Amino acid sequence: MNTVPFTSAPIEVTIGIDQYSFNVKENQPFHGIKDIPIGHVHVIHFQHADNSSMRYGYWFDCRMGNFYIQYDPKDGLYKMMEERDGAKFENIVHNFKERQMMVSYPKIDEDDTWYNLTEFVQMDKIRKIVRKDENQFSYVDSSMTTVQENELSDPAHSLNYTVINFKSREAIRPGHEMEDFLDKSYYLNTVMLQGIFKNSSNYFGELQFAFLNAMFFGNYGSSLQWHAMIELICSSATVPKHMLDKLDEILYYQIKTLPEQYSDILLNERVWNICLYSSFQKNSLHNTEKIMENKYPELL
Amino acid sequence: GAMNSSNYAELFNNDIKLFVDDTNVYRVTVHKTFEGNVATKAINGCIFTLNPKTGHLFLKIIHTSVWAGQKRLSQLAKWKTAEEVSALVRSLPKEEQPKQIIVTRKAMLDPLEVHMLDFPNIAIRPTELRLPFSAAMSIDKLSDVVMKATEPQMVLFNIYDDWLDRISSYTAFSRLTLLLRALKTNEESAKMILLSDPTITIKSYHLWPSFTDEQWITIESQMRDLILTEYGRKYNV
């Protein structure tokens, strides 16, 4: 079990840790989060009570170091920092706990939801999409644009998602215009899986990361990327059987986790109607189709 | 974006633009079979690609052989159109390449954008103009060359004949659209108006009769009358 201590909580905030959220009041004696399962990635996110503009947070892996949160009253945000002095860190987290001013990561043992949502997400891929090599953890917020979006303006503060564009030379082999536009199998299998991702695990890792950035931060460019990576698989006549069967499980848990009152802003009606009811894989997403029909029928 | 009537002039500025109409690319007759079923037979079609400033018409004849053994022909027709328009643009010197292609049917947008990926500075746009280019096959000389074709074939015309010697490109386009709208609304009566005087002829190298300026005023009047008459008949007004 790992800990993320906080120096203090000077401003009223909603704090998320993975799929859970709690409230902290202004200058409440809060000193962070204990009892965090190791192994995965995690995300710790913030939305200020006094200004719900800019949600932001940090992706991290407790195995890569000792992380803490300290509010910066100049920049006006909770900042993640690494404690390089392990003895000092062990001294704080053995004591603040002995104080009991920390909230417990509340993992139900039947509940494997966070593992299902991050199965393919890896910190090393996250640090390629979010470029800040001096930190072991990666900052994302509501407003960050994607490299693709910047192509249609500060590259340091951008989400370096794999560019997917169905009407680009990369997607369309000269001489195969109709074939490749109607059946994106070439673009999926040769360009994206063989060429760029190298395997379906890295593909799914980016798709899962994009979904979580869309859900946790309301990051629009992340939602576009999530939808694009679903549509590319569904619009291909030729997809390995294992990938379709895994895609059904990935999407089911994402739909299951999505806040009920967030369906208007996080689901693209066009993409979901196409994938579930028109696409080559319309009959390949049984579990996803069933939860969407029963949970979000208004969209379809 | 989608062309209309505020910017109706922009059409006739110095930026080269082409209208693409695909309504006559895939054409069929619908007839009864021996089993008492109904069967289509394809007949030759054409892509109508027009420079509205110059009158230059690139008529790509679509021979029925293109459909042989193909499925979903109405879908294929949009992609065939896009292929041939792209090929036409590639065949032109850079200084003659259009800066805009305006498709008369929004269904042409994705096929044309995909075939034109090599030309990222050529804007592919729909229009809010309801243009009567479907009636191109009512022009006898265009219909004759399409129906006689035994192979794929590109034929060049000036759809304004010599009008630009005497009127603006705006005025010539307005005359063309009136004539085509009349031929679309009542083809036989529109042809009667044009061919009523056997003393006014069509030059070997023209599509339309050699009307004087005054005769064109009278012809345009008779075409407006034909359209209004047909409106009254359809809506009992």
What is the CATH number for B101?
A: 3.30.420.230
Compute how many other C-beta atoms are within 10 angstroms of the C-beta atom of residue A193. 20
Contact A226, A210 (CB under 8 A): yes
Contact A3, A12 (CB under 8 A): no
Q: Where are the beta strands (DSSP E) in chain B?
A: 17-21, 27-32, 38-43, 45-50, 56-62, 100-103, 123-125, 153-158
The torsion angle over the Cα atoms of residues B84, B87, B93 and B99, rounded to 10 degrees, is 60
Query: Which among B88, B121, B123, B94 has a CA at the least distance from the CA of B109?
Result: B123
Whether A156 has its CB under 8 Å from any CB of chain B: the answer is no
* Radius of gyration, CA atoms only, chain B: 19
Same domain, B29 and B124: yes
Same domain, B130 and B197: no
Please report whether residue B210 resides in a domain. Answer: yes
Q: Which residues pair with B87 in a beta bridge?
A: none
Last residue of a domain, one of A84, A108, A143: A143
Taking the CA atoms of A153, A158, A164 and A166 in sequence, report the sign of the dihedral they define.
negative
Contacts of B68 (CB under 8 A, 6+ apart): none
Contacts of A184 (CB under 8 A, 6+ apart): A166, A171, A232, A235, A236
Report d(CA A99, CA A101) in Å as an integer. 6
Same domain, A220 and A107: no
Same domain, A28 and A115: yes
Last residue of a domain, one of B128, B163, B198: B163
User: Which technique was used to obtain these atomic coordinates?
Assistant: X-ray
Whether B115 has its CB under 8 Å from any CB of chain A: the answer is yes
Q: Which residues pair with B125 in a beta bridge?
A: B102
Last residue of a domain, one of A123, A143, A163: A143
Q: Domain count for chain A, please give it.
A: 2
Contacts of B179 (CB under 8 A, 6+ apart): B190, B194, B208, B223
Compute how many other C-beta atoms are within 10 angstroms of the C-beta atom of residue B8. 13
The pair of structure tokens assigned to A85 is 């002095």
- 3-state secondary structure at position B41: strand
Same domain, B154 and B188: no
The pair of structure tokens assigned to B104 is 């008369």
Residue A271 is part of which domain span?
Answer: 144-300
Contact A87, A61 (CB under 8 A): no
Does the beta-carbon distance from A177 to B118 stay under 8 Å?
A: no
Report d(CA B219, CA B189) in Å as an integer. 12
Contact B206, B162 (CB under 8 A): yes
Q: Domain count for chain B, please give it.
A: 2
Which strand ranges, in their side-by-side order, compose the sheet holding B45-50?
B123-125, B100-103, B17-21, B45-50, B56-62, B153-158
Q: How many Å lie between the alpha carbon of A61 and the closest alpha carbon of chain B?
A: 42
- 3-state secondary structure at position B234: helix
Contact A241, A270 (CB under 8 A): no
Contacts of A215 (CB under 8 A, 6+ apart): A254, A257, A258, A259, A262, A266
Same domain, B43 and B108: yes
- 3-state secondary structure at position B164: helix
The torsion angle over the Cα atoms of residues B46, B51, B52 and B53, rounded to 10 degrees, is -160
User: Beta strand A13-17 with A20-24: parallel, antiparallel or unpaired?
Assistant: antiparallel
Same domain, B65 and B102: yes
Contacts of A231 (CB under 8 A, 6+ apart): A166, A271, A274, A275, A279
The CA distances from residue A97 to A93, A101, B50, B105, in Å, are 6, 7, 79, 69
Contacts of A100 (CB under 8 A, 6+ apart): none
Q: Which long-range contacts (CB under 8 A, 24 or more apart) does B220-225 make?
A: B220/B175, B220/B178, B222/B193, B223/B178, B223/B179, B223/B181, B223/B182, B223/B190, B223/B193, B224/B178
Residue type at B23 in one-letter notation: T
Does the beta-carbon distance from A177 to B76 stay under 8 Å?
A: no
The pair of structure tokens assigned to A2 is 């790992």
Whether A172 has its CB under 8 Å from any CB of chain B: the answer is yes
Does the beta-carbon distance from B111 to A177 stay under 8 Å?
A: yes
Compute how many other C-beta atoms are within 10 angstroms of the C-beta atom of residue A24. 21
Same domain, B44 and B60: yes
Report d(CA A29, CA A102) in Å as an integer. 9
Same domain, B169 and B147: no
Last residue of a domain, one of A143, A167, A185: A143
Does the beta-carbon distance from B114 to A172 stay under 8 Å?
A: yes
CATH of the domain at A158: 1.25.40.550
Same domain, A161 and A294: yes
The label of the residue with tokens 């009223």 reads A12
Breaks (C-N over 2.5 A) in chain A follow: 152
Q: Quick one: angle between helices A220-234 and A241-257, nearest 10?
A: 150
The label of the residue with tokens 């305006």 reads B102
Same domain, A67 and A127: yes
Last residue of a domain, one of B163, B182, B217: B163
Residue type at A174 in one-letter notation: P
Q: Which residues pair with A275 in a beta bridge?
A: none
CATH of the domain at B236: 1.20.80.40
Residue B142 is part of which domain span?
Answer: 9-163
The full length of chain A comes to 300
Same domain, A157 and A206: yes
Q: Quick one: angle between helices B169-185 and B213-235, nearest 10?
A: 40
Query: Which among B210, B165, B217, B194 has a CA at the least distance from the CA of B54?
Result: B165
Same domain, A119 and A155: no
Taking the CA atoms of A138, A161, A216 and A116 in sequence, report the sign of the dihedral they define.
negative
Does the beta-carbon distance from A167 to B118 stay under 8 Å?
A: no
- 3-state secondary structure at position A155: helix
Please report whether residue B2 resides in a domain. Answer: no
* Radius of gyration, CA atoms only, chain A: 20
The helix (run of H) or strand (run of E) holding residue A251 is: helix A241-257
Does the beta-carbon distance from A167 to B115 stay under 8 Å?
A: no
Same domain, B111 and B216: no
Contact A43, A6 (CB under 8 A): no
Which residue of A152, A170, A177 is the best one to mutate when testing the B interface, meaning the one whose CB has the most B CBs within 10 A?
Answer: A177
